[PDB]
Amino acid sequence: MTQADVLVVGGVGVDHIVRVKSLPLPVVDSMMVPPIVTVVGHTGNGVALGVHALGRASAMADVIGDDAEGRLIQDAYSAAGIPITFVTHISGTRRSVNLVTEEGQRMSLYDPRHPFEFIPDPSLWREGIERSRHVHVSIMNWARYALRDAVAAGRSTSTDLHDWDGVADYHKDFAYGADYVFVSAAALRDESGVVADVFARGRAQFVVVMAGSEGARVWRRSDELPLRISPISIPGRPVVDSNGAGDSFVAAFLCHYLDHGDIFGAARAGAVGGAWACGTLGTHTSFVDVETLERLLAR
Amino acid sequence: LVPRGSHMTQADVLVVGGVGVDHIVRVKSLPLPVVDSMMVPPIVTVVGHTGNGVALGVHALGRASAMADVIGDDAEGRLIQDAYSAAGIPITFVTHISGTRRSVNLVTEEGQRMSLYDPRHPFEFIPDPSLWREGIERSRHVHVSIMNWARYALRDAVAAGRSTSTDLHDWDGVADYHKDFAYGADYVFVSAAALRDESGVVADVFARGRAQFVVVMAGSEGARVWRRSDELPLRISPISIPGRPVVDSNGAGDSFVAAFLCHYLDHGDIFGAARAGAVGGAWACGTLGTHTSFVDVETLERLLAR
Ligand SMILES: C[C@H]1O[C@H](O[C@H]2[C@H](O)[C@@H](O)[C@@H](O[C@H]3[C@H](O)[C@@H](O)[C@@H](O)O[C@@H]3CO)O[C@@H]2CO)[C@H](O)[C@@H](O)[C@@H]1N[C@H]1C=C(CO)[C@@H](O)[C@H](O)[C@H]1O
Ligand SMILES: C[C@H]1O[C@H](O[C@H]2[C@H](O)[C@@H](O)[C@@H](O[C@H]3[C@H](O)[C@@H](O)[C@@H](O)O[C@@H]3CO)O[C@@H]2CO)[C@H](O)[C@@H](O)[C@@H]1N[C@H]1C=C(CO)[C@@H](O)[C@H](O)[C@H]1O
Numbered sequence A: 001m002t003q004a005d006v007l008v009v010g011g012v013g014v015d016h017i018v019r020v021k022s023l024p025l026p027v028v029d030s031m032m033v034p035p036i037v038t039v040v041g042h043t044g045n046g047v048a049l050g051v052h053a054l055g056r057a058s059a060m061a062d063v064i065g066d067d068a069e070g071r072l073i074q075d076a077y078s079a080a081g082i083p084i085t086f087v088t089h090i091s092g093t094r095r096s097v098n099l100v101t102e103e104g105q106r107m108s109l110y111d112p113r114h115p116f117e118f119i120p121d122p123s124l125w126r127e128g129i130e131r132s133r134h135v136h137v138s139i140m141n142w143a144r145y146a147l148r149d150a151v152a153a154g155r156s157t158s159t160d161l162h163d164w165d166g167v168a169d170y171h172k173d174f175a176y177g178a179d180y181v182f183v184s185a186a187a188l189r190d191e192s193g194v195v196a197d198v199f200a201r202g203r204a205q206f207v208v209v210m211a212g213s214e215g216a217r218v219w220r221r222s223d224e225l226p227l228r229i230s231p232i233s234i235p236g237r238p239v240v241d242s243n244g245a246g247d248s249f250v251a252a253f254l255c256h257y258l259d260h261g262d263i264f265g266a267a268r269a270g271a272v273g274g275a276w277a278c279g280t281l282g283t284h285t286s287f288v289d290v291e292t293l294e295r296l297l298a299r
Numbered sequence B: 001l002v003p004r005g006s007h008m009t010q011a012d013v014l015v016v017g018g019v020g021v022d023h024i025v026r027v028k029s030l031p032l033p034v035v036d037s038m039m040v041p042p043i044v045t046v047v048g049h050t051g052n053g054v055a056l057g058v059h060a061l062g063r064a065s066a067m068a069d070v071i072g073d074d075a076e077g078r079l080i081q082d083a084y085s086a087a088g089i090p091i092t093f094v095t096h097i098s099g100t101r102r103s104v105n106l107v108t109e110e111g112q113r114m115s116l117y118d119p120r121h122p123f124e125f126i127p128d129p130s131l132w133r134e135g136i137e138r139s140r141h142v143h144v145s146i147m148n149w150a151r152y153a154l155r156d157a158v159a160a161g162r163s164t165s166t167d168l169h170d171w172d173g174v175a176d177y178h179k180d181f182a183y184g185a186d187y188v189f190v191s192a193a194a195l196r197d198e199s200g201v202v203a204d205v206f207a208r209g210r211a212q213f214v215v216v217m218a219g220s221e222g223a224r225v226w227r228r229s230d231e232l233p234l235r236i237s238p239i240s241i242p243g244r245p246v247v248d249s250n251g252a253g254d255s256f257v258a259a260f261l262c263h264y265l266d267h268g269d270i271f272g273a274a275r276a277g278a279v280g281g282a283w284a285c286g287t288l289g290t291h292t293s294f295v296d297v298e299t300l301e302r303l304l305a306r
């Protein structure tokens, strides 16, 4: 209802976390695992929580289900002080089963669940856009038009492409359409070439590549080479689950860049918080606050 | 930690322990691919696990079942609860902080299953026998699922002169965990899967336990029934159902057990019941993991005539 700093569009669901000895899975008919937790998650949700956790004002706009999980999300967001605007789809809330090893390897078994061709009433995101400084668009299929609207409304825009080929046409609208572009180095064949293209064919102001344990890479039009942002080791806090890490990174970065306009400072800030999300198990269970950030950012 | 739920009438089969929740994920193929993210069709969340299987199968066969287990104060715990009220099945339970059992089942378009099982209860946890003792009094037969605490339910059930049965599932024949169930129950079911010296284990069970007979289930190869009297196992042909091809062998053992019991309680024919269980198990193979479907009396009797 009120002004928000970051509007997140889409990307809230439910995650089922199974801790396994190692990946690829053994050859068995039945294997016993430690407790399988069920948490609210998915990329958009991560960013929103992270922003809110940093004292800033976030807000959600997504398609959830008339599920039990839809309602879990609903008053989970009411538990925190986070505005959520949703429409319910018959097909139900997105959810996923994530396999995690005790050393960090992650595989995600993802259930988008919504009709690929489905578009919610644009008022879903359009009202958010009027009351928001920045818009983070998560790569739900319909969310592309939110980005379209957001840019047209002269809001700063961001997106997370996640694993993306660097080739596929699906992600492309987000890659070329958003001001600040985040993507995981995971499936990138020619990062150099992919970045260069985005700069050429899109309104990408800069491109931040997240590469797990080896940190993150920041690309600028001005620099032919990426600025390398080393991963942060937290004194007292070891890595447990790198799920929600990207979203946490993004959350910190945005919050920092919205205030300072320093791109590297924000990248450093994102490296923290990204690292903080690793000290906890379970996607989007723990986020860094302001006080904790500034202490570690002096470090 | 004092039992509650709904239980008032006489029951044919009391199932002790073994109810939980399954998360079913349909996968392209197994062994799992090497990737960071792949999309799958809708992941359904259904009530399941071994005890639940027996109880449901019995219920589907026109007889009266009933549950006694440890569930959680979970959402999944409450899922189970009014799933059992949807059907006409009495459940009596105690709640543990650690929550309801769960499992993640990976299933292929070919039938292949991997189960990631979460017992969740403290291994050393024992509910107050009042959980199952009222059940035992209002029941003709007691099926004990190999939950660790269920160990004493069986003992109590036996002392109450009820006929008893259990499903040991995978068992090498060496572990001491299963032994109390193996030696303590009247009708013993075990999967041939991890049995190294099947013969010797049986001989032992008969010798050191009160096993009246032992039913070895061997998937696609049918089932073997052992008696003290015959030195060789009687082989029960796997049954092919007309109109219903094999698609998913998930739930077959529990289904086998339910049908067997219901038949043996009525007729006392062991080979006859064994044949019925073969049908019940085959029906579960005709079922896809996501649908809960058990054979009724009519289909059973028809196919048992064939
Ligand atoms: C957020 C999500 O992003 C990625 O998923 C996207 C796919 O990569 C896209 O290809 C597209 O999938 C569509 C396919 O083209 C096609 O199958 C069509 O039928 O519809 C599909 C659904 O639209 O869109 C997907 C997003 O909707 C990525 O692969 C996936 O891993 C990402 N989800 C993870 C995010 C987090 C936290 O950041 C975890 O909590 C989730 O469990 C992960 O699943
Ligand atoms: C029903 C379940 O039975 C079997 O699981 C038992 C284990 O084989 C036992 O060794 C014992 O495990 C305990 C360990 O001994 C102990 O050291 C500690 O690790 O705690 C363990 C849990 O108490 O007891 C287990 C039963 O509590 C079998 O291995 C397992 O596969 C069986 N579950 C299947 C049954 C169904 C439906 O028929 C599915 O829903 C499950 O996903 C299957 O896994």
Ligand SMILES: Nc1ncnc2c1ncn2[C@@H]1O[C@H](COP(=O)(O)OP(=O)(O)NP(=O)(O)O)[C@@H](O)[C@H]1O
Pocket: A043, A162, A163, A183, A184, A185, A209, A210, A211, A212, A213, A214, A215, A216, A231, A232, A233, A239, A242, A243, A244, A245, A246, A247, A249, A270, A271, A272, A274, A275, A278
């Ligand atoms: N082991 C680690 N040690 C320190 N920092 C880490 C570690 N793993 C990840 N990070 C930080 O967290 C960020 C996110 O990691 P990464 O796994 O690359 O994102 P991601 O794979 O896209 N996660 P997701 O958004 O769910 O797809 C990285 O860019 C680092 O800044």
Ligand SMILES: Nc1ncnc2c1ncn2[C@@H]1O[C@H](COP(=O)(O)OP(=O)(O)NP(=O)(O)O)[C@@H](O)[C@H]1O
Pocket: B169, B191, B192, B216, B217, B218, B219, B220, B221, B222, B223, B237, B238, B239, B246, B249, B250, B251, B252, B253, B254, B255, B256, B277, B278, B279, B280, B281, B282, B285
């Ligand atoms: N592929 C199959 N085709 C036909 N009948 C089958 C097939 N698999 C199993 N059966 C029947 O179903 C019974 C159960 O077999 P089995 O898979 O060993 O039980 P299980 O291992 O306990 N599976 P579960 O129900 O999860 O405990 C067998 O004894 C057969 O009678």
Ligand SMILES: [Mn+2]
Pocket: A160, A161, A162, A163, A184, A246, A247
């Ligand atoms: Mn990501």
Ligand SMILES: [Mn+2]
Pocket: B167, B169, B170, B191, B253, B254
């Ligand atoms: Mn079994």
